[model samples]
Target: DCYHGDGQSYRGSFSTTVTGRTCQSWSSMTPHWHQRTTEYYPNGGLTRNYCRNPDAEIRPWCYTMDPSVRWEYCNLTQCPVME
Candidate 1:
């Protein structure tokens, strides 16, 4: 029923992979770029940025250009809902 006994919807319970989006590597063996998060404002506009290897992987990992700077959430398009 896509809901629990309490009637809470499972909308935010899980996250589906964003489509029409792919990360690119700045260089070989250097780092790959990817969006971390995306927060929407009440005004209807949004902002986004990379998370720099969020999973903390090894070879296929990536990093940010400015080490001193921390990244914020990235904007994402809506994923299709399955029936």
Candidate 2:
């Protein structure tokens, strides 16, 4: 999920890793994704990117919330079940 207003947007992405393998990707803005630590998700992984204006001509500010979290693409949008 994602949220937007005034031409700006908020979004999230996440990744999981274990042993020598890691699987990471974008996640929605759902409540399930928030209020959680990196160690709680499957694979003992929890990292997220909070982003704005993700698709702008010049990319908006974005960064990983967890160490070593990586992704090839980013996700964006708001929540449908919550405000």
lDDT of 2 by residue, 1-83 (tens): 44444214343332222222223222533222333333343332233433333334232233333345432222433345544
In model 1, which residue pairs have backbone atoms overlapping below 3 Å? 37-73, 37-74, 38-74
Full-model lDDT for every candidate = 0.26, 0.33
Candidate 1 lDDT tens digits, 1-83 = 12222211122222111221233322322243434332212221112222122333221112333433223222232344656
Off by over 4 Å in 1: 1-53, 56-69
Highest-lDDT candidate: 2
What is the clash count of model 2? 7
